[PDB]
């Protein structure tokens, strides 16, 4: 039980142990804030996430133990890992603040797409990498439905991390069925999410640059074609297909003529992530094993996720439950080495 | 006049190397590089051959690249690596994306032998006085090594010893200077000498001076043997909350190292006073070392030297990943072998 100190930054209270120094606000909203700071018994840079307004809803309270049980549970090289979580609270009747730690992020995808030309080998090892974590992050029932470079950190060595930075447009990276409000939707929309990802990594470019969500499926029509027979047989919702049904037919590109100065692996991995049908998609675990990674793959190197339950959304609990639930896993926490 | 080179793939890498280099094996791998031990048929030497990994991927990684070559190309001294060759299978700039680097193949490193046999004090001054002997040219240059460490100081069958850099991806903590835990933004040189202590030390007494098990427990350990801040150097601390910080802990004196150090020359114990002290300001330099008594039988003022001027220039530059690789090329290109 360290000791805490407190201090302001913008309107907000940062009450935390004394191993964490210089604390610097690097983004805030309404999920919560972080601070940038030094980690004293370390002497690694740290984000300390203080959660916004915890128990405050119903909602947030849930959101709140959701977080902290997932994050206790993550533990893969290419997902962002949990190094401590601390509240300044002694008991669960003072237990209203709640605070986050991992190593701090400097770089994203982003800050590397911007600086250079990604020759094929280094496209090869960073969509290795999100896959890899992405196939851990399935395995968990857990879907990420943000995927977008911003979200998703890269060190000095090129090694990534998939993180949630949410406190370069998320709908650029957005599968169309979730533009669509499709009534359910399942992990293969982080699938949509890499292909335009892994696009970006090959031209240098975004894929599709919409303006707004119609601007967006307008643009991925044009590149992938209006939906087929098969497809149409499988929407519940009469007005979509009303609608789609009224479009002019567009035909599918061919990826090769698009992605001229691509390799040809590339090209047919990207055939296979881009599919309007999410059930025709490719899934993490089988594009792991697509010749485009074959200098990388390793199925006894590729873990998946240990079997405490991450997806119990029938769960109808009170602010109280939700808070004691999360108070007994900060307690419980133990650092990892 | 370019050498044929072969391919061969060891460990998932591939290495394609000149012929003269024969018989690679693999002696270790990291992120920022693996080496394969060899035989130079040009020389009839054992070496050391390091392909850098990814070495023009990043920005940080091309950087260090040419950071590396630029380094080891200006080092010439006895008790520091020498770069025997640098080369690459690209016949042109545009072809250019593998660096490999030759040295020396280095035995055992210090550690090996601190676990391996209790160590006289002739022993303990030899290796003491190579390593100032190095550092005083690697200071000279204005470097700081920053990591020095047993695992990083190679000794061979003959006691003769070098400085490299050993690492690829025994804690770095247990050596380093207490500035540098404190995250003090500007640390300069002194912070090898506080490493060449606690290196001399475990010598001495065959055992890790400060075995910490994080950063606080590390400077909770040295306060124990050299005491918690004097008047004096609190005052170089220009912040409130730290100075009472320090002011709140059980104050710790400073033991007398001649009654720590038990049994040890007391040449050995009056230089370690002077390497162990907190204040960096006031700690014995590479070249003031060389001249304590402890080294009378080794010390040479005319055998001591000192680096040619080092341009250190592009450390403060920030160029685009194919101006470090053009750099690095002409490095490569402009490369003449030791004789
Ligand atoms: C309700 C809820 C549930 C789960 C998440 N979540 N999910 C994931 C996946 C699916 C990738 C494992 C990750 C999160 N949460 C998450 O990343 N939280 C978190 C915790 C602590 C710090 C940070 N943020 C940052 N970490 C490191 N460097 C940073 C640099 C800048 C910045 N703005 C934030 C940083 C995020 C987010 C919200
Ligand atoms: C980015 C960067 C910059 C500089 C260095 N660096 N710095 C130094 C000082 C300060 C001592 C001059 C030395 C290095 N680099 C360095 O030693 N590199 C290097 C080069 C070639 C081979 C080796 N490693 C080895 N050399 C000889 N025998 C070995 C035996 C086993 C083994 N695993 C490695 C060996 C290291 C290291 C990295
Ligand atoms: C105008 C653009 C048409 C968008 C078509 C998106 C098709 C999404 O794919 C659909 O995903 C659903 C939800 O996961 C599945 O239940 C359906 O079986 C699958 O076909
Ligand atoms: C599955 C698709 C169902 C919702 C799609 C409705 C979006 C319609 O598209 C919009 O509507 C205007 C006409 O209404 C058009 O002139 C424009 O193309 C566009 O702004
Ligand atoms: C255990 C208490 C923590 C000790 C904190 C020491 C950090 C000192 O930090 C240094 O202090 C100097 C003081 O003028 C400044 O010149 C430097 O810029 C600053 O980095
Ligand atoms: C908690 C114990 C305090 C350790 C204090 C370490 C003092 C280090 O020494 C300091 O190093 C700085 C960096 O070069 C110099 O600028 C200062 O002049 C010097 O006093």
Redesign the pocket.
Same mark, same amino acid.
Request: aromatic share 6%; hydrophobic share 65%.
């Given at each position: 039980r360290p000791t805490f100190y407190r201090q302001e930054l913008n309107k907000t209270i940062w009450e935390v142990p004394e191993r964490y120094q210089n604390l610097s606000p690097?983004?805030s909203g309404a999920?919560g804030s972080?601070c $940038?700071a030094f980690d004293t018994k370390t002497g690694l840079r740290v984000?300390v996430?203080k959660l916004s307004r915890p128990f405050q809803s119903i909602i947030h309270a849930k959101?709140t133990y959701?977080?902290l049980r997932?994050?206790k549970h993550?533990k893969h090289e290419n997902?962002?890992g949990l190094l401590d979580v601390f509240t300044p609270a002694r008991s669960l009747e003072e237990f209203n603040d709640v605070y986050?730690?991992?190593?701090?992020?400097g770089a994203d995808l982003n800050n590397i797409v911007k600086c250079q030309k990604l020759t094929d080998d280094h496209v090869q090892f960073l969509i290795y990498q999100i896959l890899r974590g992405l196939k851990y992050?399935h395995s968990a029932d857990?879907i990420?439905r943000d995927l977008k470079p911003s979200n998703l $950190?890269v060190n000095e060595d090129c090694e990534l991390k998939?993180?949630?930075?949410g406190?370069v447009a998320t709908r650029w990276y957005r599968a169309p069925e979730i533009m669509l409000n499709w009534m359910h939707y399942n992990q293969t929309v982080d699938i949509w999410s890499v292909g335009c990802i892994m696009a970006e990594l090959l031209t240098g470019r975004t894929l599709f640059p919409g303006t707004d969500h119609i601007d967006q499926l307008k643009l991925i029509l044009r590149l992938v074609g209006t939906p087929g027979a098969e497809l149409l047989k499988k929407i519940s919702s009469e007005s979509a297909r009303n609608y789609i049904q009224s479009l002019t037919q567009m035909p599918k590109m061919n990826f090769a003529n698009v992605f001229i100065g691509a390799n040809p692996l590339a090209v047919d991995l990207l055939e296979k992530m881009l599919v309007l049908d999410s059930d025709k998609r490719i899934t993490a675990a089988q594009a792991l094993a697509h010749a485009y990674f074959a200098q990388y793959h390793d199925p006894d190197d590729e873990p998946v996720a240990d079997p405490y339950d991450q997806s119990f959304e029938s769960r109808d609990l009170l602010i109280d439950e939700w808070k004691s639930l999360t108070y007994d896993e900060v307690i419980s926490f133990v650092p990892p080495p």
């Open positions: 690097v983004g999920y972080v $940038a984000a996430k959101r959701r977080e997932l994050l993550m997902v962002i986050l730690v991992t190593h701090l992020m992050i857990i990420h $950190a998939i993180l949630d930075f406190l």
